[PDB]
Design an enzyme around this catalytic site. Structure first.
Site, PDB file in Angstrom:
ATOM      1  N   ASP B 106      -7.852   7.052 -10.174  1.00  0.00           N
ATOM      2  CA  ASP B 106      -7.347   5.691 -10.468  1.00  0.00           C
ATOM      3  C   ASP B 106      -5.898   5.838 -10.961  1.00  0.00           C
ATOM      4  O   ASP B 106      -5.119   6.532 -10.259  1.00  0.00           O
ATOM      5  CB  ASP B 106      -8.352   5.016 -11.404  1.00  0.00           C
ATOM      6  CG  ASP B 106      -7.947   3.632 -11.828  1.00  0.00           C
ATOM      7  OD1 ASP B 106      -8.209   2.702 -11.044  1.00  0.00           O
ATOM      8  OD2 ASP B 106      -7.372   3.508 -12.931  1.00  0.00           O
ATOM      9  N   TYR B 154      -7.132  -9.347 -10.113  1.00  0.00           N
ATOM     10  CA  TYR B 154      -7.327  -8.888 -11.520  1.00  0.00           C
ATOM     11  C   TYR B 154      -5.986  -8.341 -12.046  1.00  0.00           C
ATOM     12  O   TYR B 154      -5.677  -8.591 -13.234  1.00  0.00           O
ATOM     13  CB  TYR B 154      -8.490  -7.894 -11.657  1.00  0.00           C
ATOM     14  CG  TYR B 154      -8.170  -6.501 -11.191  1.00  0.00           C
ATOM     15  CD1 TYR B 154      -7.611  -5.567 -12.049  1.00  0.00           C
ATOM     16  CD2 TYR B 154      -8.405  -6.115  -9.884  1.00  0.00           C
ATOM     17  CE1 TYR B 154      -7.276  -4.293 -11.613  1.00  0.00           C
ATOM     18  CE2 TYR B 154      -8.087  -4.842  -9.433  1.00  0.00           C
ATOM     19  CZ  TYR B 154      -7.506  -3.924 -10.296  1.00  0.00           C
ATOM     20  OH  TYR B 154      -7.164  -2.670  -9.841  1.00  0.00           O
ATOM     21  N   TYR B 237      -0.297  -1.078 -16.076  1.00  0.00           N
ATOM     22  CA  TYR B 237      -0.387  -2.119 -15.015  1.00  0.00           C
ATOM     23  C   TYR B 237       0.885  -2.984 -14.975  1.00  0.00           C
ATOM     24  O   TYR B 237       1.001  -3.811 -14.055  1.00  0.00           O
ATOM     25  CB  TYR B 237      -1.636  -2.979 -15.237  1.00  0.00           C
ATOM     26  CG  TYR B 237      -2.897  -2.471 -14.591  1.00  0.00           C
ATOM     27  CD1 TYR B 237      -3.015  -2.481 -13.216  1.00  0.00           C
ATOM     28  CD2 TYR B 237      -3.971  -1.988 -15.330  1.00  0.00           C
ATOM     29  CE1 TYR B 237      -4.162  -2.049 -12.585  1.00  0.00           C
ATOM     30  CE2 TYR B 237      -5.131  -1.533 -14.711  1.00  0.00           C
ATOM     31  CZ  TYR B 237      -5.223  -1.570 -13.331  1.00  0.00           C
ATOM     32  OH  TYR B 237      -6.323  -1.138 -12.642  1.00  0.00           O
ATOM     33  N   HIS B 295     -16.210   2.685  -7.850  1.00  0.00           N
ATOM     34  CA  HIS B 295     -14.913   3.004  -8.481  1.00  0.00           C
ATOM     35  C   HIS B 295     -15.061   4.180  -9.460  1.00  0.00           C
ATOM     36  O   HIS B 295     -14.166   5.032  -9.510  1.00  0.00           O
ATOM     37  CB  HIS B 295     -14.364   1.760  -9.164  1.00  0.00           C
ATOM     38  CG  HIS B 295     -13.040   2.036  -9.780  1.00  0.00           C
ATOM     39  ND1 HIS B 295     -11.935   2.329  -9.008  1.00  0.00           N
ATOM     40  CD2 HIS B 295     -12.650   2.120 -11.063  1.00  0.00           C
ATOM     41  CE1 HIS B 295     -10.908   2.574  -9.794  1.00  0.00           C
ATOM     42  NE2 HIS B 295     -11.307   2.423 -11.066  1.00  0.00           N
TER      43      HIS B 295
HETATM   44  C1  J0U Z   1      -1.667   2.664  -4.033  1.00  0.00           C
HETATM   45  C2  J0U Z   1      -2.295   1.648  -4.604  1.00  0.00           C
HETATM   46  C3  J0U Z   1      -3.487   1.009  -3.965  1.00  0.00           C
HETATM   47  C4  J0U Z   1      -1.816   1.062  -5.911  1.00  0.00           C
HETATM   48  C5  J0U Z   1      -2.947   0.648  -6.867  1.00  0.00           C
HETATM   49  C6  J0U Z   1      -3.669   1.782  -7.529  1.00  0.00           C
HETATM   50  C7  J0U Z   1      -4.227   1.786  -8.726  1.00  0.00           C
HETATM   51  C8  J0U Z   1      -4.436   0.532  -9.516  1.00  0.00           C
HETATM   52  C9  J0U Z   1      -4.703   3.034  -9.405  1.00  0.00           C
HETATM   53  C10 J0U Z   1      -0.903  -0.133  -5.625  1.00  0.00           C
HETATM   54  C11 J0U Z   1      -0.248  -0.660  -6.870  1.00  0.00           C
HETATM   55  C12 J0U Z   1      -0.746  -1.795  -7.522  1.00  0.00           C
HETATM   56  O1  J0U Z   1      -1.813  -2.478  -6.997  1.00  0.00           O
HETATM   57  C13 J0U Z   1      -0.165  -2.258  -8.693  1.00  0.00           C
HETATM   58  C14 J0U Z   1       0.914  -1.581  -9.248  1.00  0.00           C
HETATM   59  O2  J0U Z   1       1.556  -1.981 -10.373  1.00  0.00           O
HETATM   60  C15 J0U Z   1       0.991  -3.025 -11.168  1.00  0.00           C
HETATM   61  C16 J0U Z   1       1.429  -0.427  -8.620  1.00  0.00           C
HETATM   62  C17 J0U Z   1       0.812   0.043  -7.465  1.00  0.00           C
HETATM   63  O3  J0U Z   1       1.347   1.112  -6.804  1.00  0.00           O
HETATM   64  C18 J0U Z   1       2.799   0.935  -6.713  1.00  0.00           C
HETATM   65  C19 J0U Z   1       3.380   1.897  -5.714  1.00  0.00           C
HETATM   66  C20 J0U Z   1       3.753   1.449  -4.450  1.00  0.00           C
HETATM   67  C21 J0U Z   1       4.313   2.320  -3.525  1.00  0.00           C
HETATM   68  C22 J0U Z   1       4.514   3.647  -3.858  1.00  0.00           C
HETATM   69  O4  J0U Z   1       5.065   4.518  -2.975  1.00  0.00           O
HETATM   70  C23 J0U Z   1       4.155   4.116  -5.107  1.00  0.00           C
HETATM   71  C24 J0U Z   1       3.599   3.244  -6.030  1.00  0.00           C
HETATM   72  O5  J0U Z   1       3.253   3.725  -7.261  1.00  0.00           O
HETATM   73  C25 J0U Z   1       3.420   0.985  -8.108  1.00  0.00           C
HETATM   74  C26 J0U Z   1       2.558   0.311  -9.155  1.00  0.00           C
HETATM   75  O6  J0U Z   1       2.785   0.426 -10.376  1.00  0.00           O
END
Ligand code: J0U
Ligand code: J0U
Lengths: 316, 319
Positions: B106, B154, B237, B295
């Site tokens: 996660d 969420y 987050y 999860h």
């Molecule tokens: C790869 C995923 C599915 C991320 C979600 C994963 C978890 C919640 C552990 C996507 C995502 C979010 O939905 C919310 C976020 O910031 C509130 C972030 C996030 O990932 C972002 C992100 C995008 C592109 C990339 O190359 C790297 C990244 O970290 C950043 C972020 O904080």
């Protein structure tokens, strides 16, 4: 060769209200460093970074009674048997099936007993200054002590409260007076018990040994304000219990790899006291450091480092 | 080991003046650093810690920044990926570890992909549970990606400081009993948390115990979270744009170190599909996949996680 806030600090509960603190540096085989009286994990400050750099995982203990480790007041909390079983529990809770054990002074005594009674848990054993001598079953323990004049200070240490009052009186004076090269000595372990106590005929304001800075001395001062000298002095108050436990080991030999390091100018733990350790450990490897007093790690860090690393890389 | 906290070595490393990281430590051998997700604990690795140690590894199970006995500063910017990764490097430096294997789940999985990206010299190998490595798109924002996927609603409710805290901290036993369930036992909708008030407004007051957890395990997470509550965990987050900008600064370099992606069939937010093109960016990528796994992968399928991690550790990171 470090400062404390830059160290990883570890705490293990070995029984209900008894936890051991250690400092931890490096990856590789586990090497457990056990300090003497009255010292600290900090006494290994020159060894910790060298052994880590040579490919070892270093656990530098605060031994029971010291620093951030529990210091229960009862004398029997500090016999070798209680202290060794706790170290075994320490390995168990860390998930180490073995460690290399390296001790100096009382820590040297602990590691010899660990190797004797817990050889399955000790990969290899190295002592600085402290010899291994099997239990002499009709030499009265107390007779050995008053048969060596330079062990007179140990008699002064027996009466609970006395050495504590004198050692705790002025901590900066205690440590500046103890931690000296042997040619800088201001002490006479000869006539302690009858000539007052320990510091009666020695400077009120001792100079700084060439071995130590003021910062180094202030580190030992700060540590010893937590619990003082009762726990540390209790290591010296289990002679009969220690002898009786050692006796129960009878024939058995140390079959694991072993290093004995002597110090030419330790006048209490004299090199000659090791001289027949081959009879009981014939494989035993040896080191010897010239111009080196009792405070071996602090007096000859370069020499200690080269001897421990060479030995660690070769036997075990 | 497993159950009992007072049966473990506890370690503490000051990584900067206001911040010290706590970890549990078990075993000898190569250093494996386990990084939990939201809202969890070193304790989420309780089944992996003794298994990896018995397989010949030195396990360091972190309380991540914001959790348990680790520092939980209140500022959001203290929980962007860039600050969290730099701190994990300082953590290795002060422990005298030239490298470690990093295994994350996660938000922890996110952290270990970023370590692998920006600090590969310090990362022996990297394994993520559930969380994919997707290289940053310079054209769309997190806000546009998030909004697009309704199952990330969420995440929007989490952005407003104080709100998700109040709800999550209201009844900690209820929070953990509601969160920590198998997929088929879910009492939650991550679809419209936002419009429908909050996370638990239409879910049981006294939820049942998941088949995954005992009352004692839940009480452990409750006790840990009494110290600092959910503010720091929720700040993980609230750094989407900072994280995106940092990730862009990679400029499409590759992760060249050995890598493992483990997918969970029934994780309905970190869907296996989201990992599908990770080979393009990770040459040495191996895969694991767990059936009937939600999860909370380590809790849900401990046996399957233990076999996949041990097999991969013993082939692609020495032992
Ligand atoms: C790869 C995923 C599915 C991320 C979600 C994963 C978890 C919640 C552990 C996507 C995502 C979010 O939905 C919310 C976020 O910031 C509130 C972030 C996030 O990932 C972002 C992100 C995008 C592109 C990339 O190359 C790297 C990244 O970290 C950043 C972020 O904080
Ligand atoms: C010179 C030595 C090898 C021992 C002392 C060494 C240090 C002070 C580190 C001798 C000694 C003492 O003088 C005082 C003691 O109890 C106050 C003890 C002690 O060692 C005793 C001992 C005897 C036989 C044996 O096989 C092992 C032993 O440890 C016990 C003791 O506590």
């Amino acid at each position: 060769s470090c400062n404390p806030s830059d160290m990883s600090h570890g705490y293990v509960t070995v029984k209900p209200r008894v936890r051991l603190h250690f400092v931890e540096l490096g990856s590789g085989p586990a090497v457990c460093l056990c300090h003497g009286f009255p010292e600290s994990w900090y006494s290994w400050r020159y060894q910790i970074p060298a052994l880590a750099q040579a490919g070892y995982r270093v656990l530098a203990m605060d031994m029971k009674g010291y620093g951030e480790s529990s210091a229960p007041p009862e004398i029997e909390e500090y016999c070798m048997e209680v202290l060794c079983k706790e170290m075994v529990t320490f390995l168990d809770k860390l998930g180490l099936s073995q460690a290399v054990f390296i001790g100096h002074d009382w820590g040297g005594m602990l590691v010899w007993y660990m190797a004797l009674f817990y050889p399955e848990r000790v990969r290899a054993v190295a002592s600085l200054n402290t010899p291994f001598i099997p239990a002499n079953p009709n030499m009265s323990p107390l007779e050995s002590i008053k048969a060596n004049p330079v062990f007179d200070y140990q008699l002064y240490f027996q009466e609970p409260g006395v050495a504590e009052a004198e050692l705790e009186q002025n901590l900066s004076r205690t440590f500046k007076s103890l931690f000296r090269a042997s040619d800088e000595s201001v002490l006479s372990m000869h006539k302690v018990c009858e000539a007052g106590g320990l510091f009666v005929n020695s400077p009120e304001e001792p100079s700084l040994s060439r071995m130590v800075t003021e910062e180094e001395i202030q580190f030992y001062v700060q540590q010893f304000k937590k619990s003082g000298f009762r726990g540390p002095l209790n290591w010296y108050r289990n002679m009969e219990r220690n002898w009786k436990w050692a006796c129960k080991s009878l024939g058995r030999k140390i079959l694991i790899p072993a290093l004995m390091v002597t110090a030419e100018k330790d006048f209490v733990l004299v090199p000659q006291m090791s001289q027949h350790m081959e009879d009981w450990i014939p494989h035993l490897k040896r080191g010897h450091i010239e111009d080196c007093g009792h405070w071996t790690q602090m007096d000859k860090p370069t020499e200690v480092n080269q001897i421990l690393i060479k030995w660690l890389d070769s036997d075990a």
